[PDB]
Amino acid sequence: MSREEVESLIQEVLEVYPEKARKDRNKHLAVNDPAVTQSKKCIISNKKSQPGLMTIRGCAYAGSKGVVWGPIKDMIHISHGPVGCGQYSRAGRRNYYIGTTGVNAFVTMNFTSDFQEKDIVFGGDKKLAKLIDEVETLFPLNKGISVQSECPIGLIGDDIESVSKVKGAELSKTIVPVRCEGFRGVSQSLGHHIANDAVRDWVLGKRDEDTTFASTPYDVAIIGDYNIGGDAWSSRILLEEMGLRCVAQWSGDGSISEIELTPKVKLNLVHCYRSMNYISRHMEEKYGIPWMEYNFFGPTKTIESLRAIAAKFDESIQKKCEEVIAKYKPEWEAVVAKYRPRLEGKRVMLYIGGLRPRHVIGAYEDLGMEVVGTGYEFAHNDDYDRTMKEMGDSTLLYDDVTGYEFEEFVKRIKPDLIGSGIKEKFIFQKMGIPFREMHSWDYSGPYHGFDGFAIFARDMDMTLNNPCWKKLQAPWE
Amino acid sequence: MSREEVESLIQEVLEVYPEKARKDRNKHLAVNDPAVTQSKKCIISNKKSQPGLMTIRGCAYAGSKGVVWGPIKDMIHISHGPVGCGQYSRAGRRNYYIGTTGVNAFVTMNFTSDFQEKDIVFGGDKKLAKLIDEVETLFPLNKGISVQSECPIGLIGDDIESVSKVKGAELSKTIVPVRCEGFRGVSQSLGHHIANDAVRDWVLGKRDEDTTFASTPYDVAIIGDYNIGGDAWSSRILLEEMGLRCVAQWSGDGSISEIELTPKVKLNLVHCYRSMNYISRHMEEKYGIPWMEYNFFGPTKTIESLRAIAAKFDESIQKKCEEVIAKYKPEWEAVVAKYRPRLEGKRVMLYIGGLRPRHVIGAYEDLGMEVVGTGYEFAHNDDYDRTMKEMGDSTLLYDDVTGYEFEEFVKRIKPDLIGSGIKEKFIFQKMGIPFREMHSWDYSGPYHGFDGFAIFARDMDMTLNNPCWKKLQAPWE
Amino acid sequence: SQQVDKIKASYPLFLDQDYKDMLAKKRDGFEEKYPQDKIDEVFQWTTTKEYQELNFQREALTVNPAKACQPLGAVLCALGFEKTMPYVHGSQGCVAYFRSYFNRHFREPVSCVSDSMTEDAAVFGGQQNMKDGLQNCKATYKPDMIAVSTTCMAEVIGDDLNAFINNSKKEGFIPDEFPVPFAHTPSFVGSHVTGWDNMFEGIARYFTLKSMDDKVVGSNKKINIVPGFETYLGNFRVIKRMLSEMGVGYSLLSDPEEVLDTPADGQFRMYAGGTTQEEMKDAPNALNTVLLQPWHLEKTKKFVEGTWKHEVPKLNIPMGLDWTDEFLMKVSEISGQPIPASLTKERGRLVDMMTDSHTWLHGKRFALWGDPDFVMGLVKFLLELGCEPVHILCHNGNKRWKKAVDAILAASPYGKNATVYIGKDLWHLRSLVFTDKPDFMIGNSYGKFIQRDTLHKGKEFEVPLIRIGFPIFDRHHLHRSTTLGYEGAMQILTTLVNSILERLDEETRGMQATDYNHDLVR
Amino acid sequence: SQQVDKIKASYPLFLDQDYKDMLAKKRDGFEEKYPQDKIDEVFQWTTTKEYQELNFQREALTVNPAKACQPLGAVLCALGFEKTMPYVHGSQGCVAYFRSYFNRHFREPVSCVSDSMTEDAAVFGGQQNMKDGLQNCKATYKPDMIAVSTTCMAEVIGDDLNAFINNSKKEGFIPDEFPVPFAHTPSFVGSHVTGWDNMFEGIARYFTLKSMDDKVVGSNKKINIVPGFETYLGNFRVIKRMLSEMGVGYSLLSDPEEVLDTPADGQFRMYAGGTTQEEMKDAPNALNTVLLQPWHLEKTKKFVEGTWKHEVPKLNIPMGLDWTDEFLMKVSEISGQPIPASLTKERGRLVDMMTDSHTWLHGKRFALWGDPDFVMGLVKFLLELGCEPVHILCHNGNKRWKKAVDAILAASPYGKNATVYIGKDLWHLRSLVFTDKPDFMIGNSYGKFIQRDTLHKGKEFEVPLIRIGFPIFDRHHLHRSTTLGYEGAMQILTTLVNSILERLDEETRGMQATDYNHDLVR
Ligand code: ICS
Ligand code: ICS
Ligand SMILES: [Fe+3]
Ligand SMILES: [Fe+3]
């Protein structure tokens, strides 16, 4: 499809909306022109969703509890409020970790205050203090507590910061109040920002006066890698083969101590800009730690990122980087030789959260695959600025796409594969279009690094070329 | 009911038969009169089955391969002939053993010559020799081979004795030809006799000139205990707590070496008289080893048997017998106290093979239970002589009962429980009558000894008092 | 490293030596992990009776609950009506979570919209959200009905749904005749089943309250069936099948079976099947209304008995032999239809399976959890099978339900060692299975974690999980099963007995150690 | 010792210290056992490729066969006719074994009689046995029909069944009009499925051969369905249900579903349901005859095509998506009935499940065995699911069937690493799963032993068994499953994917070792 056909498709899809919704939604759909750079020109993002249009967006609690704080393994995260929010987010995200669950790690557990009517009417501060006492009694090896606010907490006037301060002083424990009520912001993104501010205010500066950490000039911290299916581990190994010492992982398989040790590193390697640029900029301002974005999706991006990271260090790190690249060249070359012939020319449409809609493009192009449509749930204008150069000409860009919009776009564009979340998977599987979960990796992965690239190619091939897709039409129809 | 009602029931059941079948079957049904203990007066047994009347009897191959030879664990037993007989008898009998299956033990495996048409037409002796070679190649740790003849072997003129002799001389291997063709005899009993003769002629006298076995005055063998669900083990422990050394077990968990060592024992303890009295009498005649029958079903019979066995030895064995009885008295007394109140007065009908229809009566009476009907598939007149004193007055005795006969008897008598084989279980379960498998112990057990008595009481109670038996009639009928 | 011909996913890729060394370096350098002996000591402590005593003293902390919030049940109830859009007035994160939860359980699309109430609506209400959302939803997805529930944010700020919808119709955002039933579903009251009950009552009231004058009880010769919160498609199907077998005219109100089982034939069907508006309007004309899950249909029962004038029978959930029998007899009495020969044969076949499997089922100890009606039906069936329920947990149960379940247990000698817990979560149950170990658990997927914990104590301490209930996330297509009626009883019986036999096979697979009992025939 | 409160069966009673000590004393004193290191060495040797080369050189020895003898199939076929007694002329031990085998598989009564030929009949024949047996069976069990097969003794002896039955009727032992169909079923030819084929051909010949003059093809507007040797009740039921949904008139010849599923209601029914004699007599008037399992219905096909003049369609077993589609389209063409919307929806739901589970099913390696038609249907469905059949074993297969299965494998890229074995037994398959390890086995209960063997090599070498086929002895009520049609495909798919997921959960249950991949959602 040419640019004119994409604009016409956008207009026909928008036709059914009421006038106000049509006017709003027109700002969130665009045809990519990599000849320009500004997102103040084509796509408006980070706005509120139109009511009743089946947005795929989550809330700030999902962005804070489910994304940033939840993966921190040795901390206990209290879903403060009614039972639902904690129950629906329990173990739904594959932020992998090593630990003894219920003893020293608590990632897949659901801790909640389980608000009843009396907690709504008379407040929940005393219940929160009692809850913290009970947590201390029953989980003595927890290294800290976070209190993730659900919607009612901010509406009933509860003061979780005072309880956090008093209980933390009394128990000599880090207790982090997070005001991530779901009605704040417009998506998970404000949850990211609130969680980052909570880290900055309650955890990050714990060891500011401490100087007993033996630091090396090769100290780095992986920021914004949540170890989905082991992704961070598949990244970390490469960074440690390059001669770097990864001091912290934020926050997949992350501990509170390594978060506290982050201000001691020489470099902050930021994978997910969207969720962690706030703390990266803060650490740059306060501790003078530079941060750089990197991409470990596919061999081309991984090699570029490894070289760019090694260029921040001495010649020994650069030599080790070349050694790692030489070591892994045959592996990913074999992966390409095996899977690119079966994926050449296949067209993909992506709809993911804040980072992956542009980050995984390089891996698809490494497999000979073309991304004809991409979009974000909750990205900001800077993410679209980054996306414009990563995306091909006359390709479709969508922000906060409605279910109707996405289904119509797929009906017209007819991609060979769709990469998106669980709420679109079965819709597009029923239309006979191969679908890949690009949040959970369809319970596969990791996809980061070379080891992840092998799995990514295998998964894309197994879903796109599955025999089932040829059997949706009955032979008598 | 009274004796007259039982005779009337017998006559009404018999009136459906044709004249010849009626005349034959009248000789196999009797009303017990324990005052008169002659099986030449009341019941005729060990006769051929009437054609087309659904006998429960098996064949001589089942009596030899399935019963006597099969349990011998370190031997490989070839089902010589077509595939069926070996396939249907594979692992159908719970003759328990310890060993590494396929390496040094072969009980649950099915070795067969798998006769085709050409083997029927041109014979199978060369195929048998080739098969023995292949057995030697693929199972080098086998300590002997038996060749159990199926029906066609004796009809096509095959000479398995010559092959056995030649191959055994060539390989320095004990190769035992067993002429247990299913058409021989009338039931499994002739299979017992043929297998016993094969043991006597090919295995038992191996160490006649050997005197390197260190023998003690307390040497005993367990003959005719096939370790069903571990029964023999539950017996053996008691005998070894009494100070006796059990040298051989025939043939449950039995090895060929311990069979060869049996002529060195001081006493042969025969549990199953029916299947092993031949070899017991032979060992008495040749080696002068006395043999005695014993019963380890239930505490009363077990205590009586232990005292009778200890009376064959010195005073130390008798003192150890009293110690064993004192040690186990509280356990079986607790079993009785728990289960007899729930089983008092319950009426049982039994139909089993050659030994158990009379041997288990003591355990039922130990639980306060009354056996109102019993009978055998293939017992001889001596078994009925032994049964007459074990059974109550005016109780029903049946030999080679037909399915119609057993169903009609159960309809009239209305027992609280039936103990029989797999071919009666579901028939009587569908009539709403609790059923216990008295061949396989319903995949439970052991039932021998005190440890077995606990399980026996638990099983009888769980089946007789199950809630399901109160639910067969729909509430709207 | 990866071999191109044998590619490893996370398991077992991270068991490789290089990954193991890297993880050990991470742990030893930067995690500041507690020493492994201390971790083992604390785990052993958590398995003990003293820890259980501390655990059951909890008053404010809930750990691993077995329940959801009301709007989930409201959405599931709304999904059972023809061309009906579930519409949750409030925050969009709730709708995202509801849809993801139901997607993972059913492996099907779940359509539900939010009006995306933000921080400004938290000050002056979500009236504008309601108007724009109703208009946008009707224009875009073209439902015949929009069924409105609430998130906790809308409940806390006190949004008046009735006034908002009336103002939406008054100002032309939606037509005045367009059906917009609503229910208040506060997440801090009850659970998801309470939300189902509230939503169903709201819909029934919307369609019948103002038109009762011309209604005559029994005029349409049908029986109303209210299933309640149900996540097995087989249960809807089996109720319909049994009623059709009897020739009983019926109206299954809130039937989501079709929309949760759409075929994959090249097109996406947002709506499929469901209770029609005509059926709900004609419902008061039925002979009676039968509540399949009466312990979370109390408000529906009050409305049906007080407005429709239906003498709702006192029936337990038709689970297991006795309660299926009672259900069929009551339906036969209400409709006048005799119980047919096919249903009698099916009952007899269930009884035959019970007799076939009783020796393996007898005396087995189960810890179970789930929703109240489901849990008591499972307890009743287990008692019928000679099994021993030991730990009966219902996080969303109440005192009256506990009294009824205790009465059920008292009627059976197999309920002697049974304890019923209400308001307890799965951490409590983990303590219970550590301190009073059952043979098996019966529950949803969350119990898998308990199994892991028990296995960490030892293989002999491991309590295997049997996945019956909601949600089931780690197995595929179990939502197609049946738990109701004779068919559901047969499925449950087969699951239980074969779980027992699979465990026994695992325990006796050790060659020359336990394989003497590795029987071919069981 | 036994604690009265917790009574131990054999497992784990014999794991107690006293029993362990006694068993060790037995072994060390009298068993003369090979040293344990030698046993381990021999086991490891049996796991290797050299042992497999020796294994596949076997010419005379068969170890653990995967087939039975003809009269078993003859008895199963005879059980499918109304009030019909299976009568095996020959030795009674065979009948005892057949009944025990079928009892253990079906957990139901199985009625069959023998005429108890003994050693005297080995010289004179079984004529007297036949006369007396037919008279006694008719008098006692009152069948409407007696279907006669043979044991190997009668076949080797040369008993002429036709002459024996004719003499029985000539001398007044049975009425001349009483139906006594017969078949020669030599156990040294073919297998149990061949016996089914012979018995069905004998019955069809008995009822139709002499009355073909007034027959007109297609006069009764029905389709004959011959199921063949079938041990899943669900398969009979699903064929009947799909044909009824299409509105297609059908006659299921040899339908044993009723007599193998009698209810437990207080009475024993020896006979139930079954193909009536009138249906068999009217069978040549059908439009056509469809053979559900053509690879063991060759004699039946020859008779139906040569005598009834039915143009039997070339149809595979209706297993899996493509072959169920082909079966339905052929039935639609023969009957003129369109395929209804319900069947289209069912097919679409099967496709939905396939898409839901393909990521877990893709690339999984399966060894499998069973009867020819069943095995090729399973292979076809596995290829449809993106699975890799690697070891395809059929003990009773032939060269032509192997050619057809190789053609099926060649048509799919997922059949590249697939080998078909005919005439090989389960010891051969043990070698194959040790040397070229698959992910799973699919077969009957005998495969459990292979699983044990593999586990003895190591946990990472263990090949779990999936029980689909005949016989299944160590699980309860699996004979109620379906393997045919879309319903059977859904059941098989669910079994396979959940077996995979259960294995993954077991492998990832190790706390702090592999539980990073112990995902709640799969
Ligand atoms: S944190 Fe963000 S929606 Fe950067 S909230 Fe979301 S585990 Fe997505 S595109 Mo789920 S900004 Fe991570 C994300 Fe990306 S949960 Fe994961 S996949 S790279
Ligand atoms: S050997 Fe005999 S039929 Fe004595 S052939 Fe049979 S394992 Fe029975 S009554 Mo099955 S003479 Fe043993 C017997 Fe008794 S197989 Fe077992 S239970 S005590
Ligand atoms: Fe049964
Ligand atoms: Fe689906």
Residue numbers in the entry:
A (entry chain C), B (entry chain A): 4 to 480
C (entry chain D), D (entry chain B): 2 to 523
Paper quotes:
Nitrogenase catalyzes the ATP-dependent reduction of dinitrogen to ammonia during the process of biological nitrogen fixation that is essential for sustaining life. The Fe-protein mediates ATP-dependent electron transfer (ET) through its [4Fe:4S] cluster to the intermediate [8Fe:7S] P-cluster in the MoFe-protein; the electrons are subsequently shuttled to a [7Fe:1Mo:9S:1C]-R-homocitrate metallocluster, the FeMo-cofactor, within the active site of the MoFe-protein. The active site FeMo-cofactor contains a [7Fe:1Mo:9S:1C] metallocluster coordinated with an R-homocitrate (HCA) molecule.
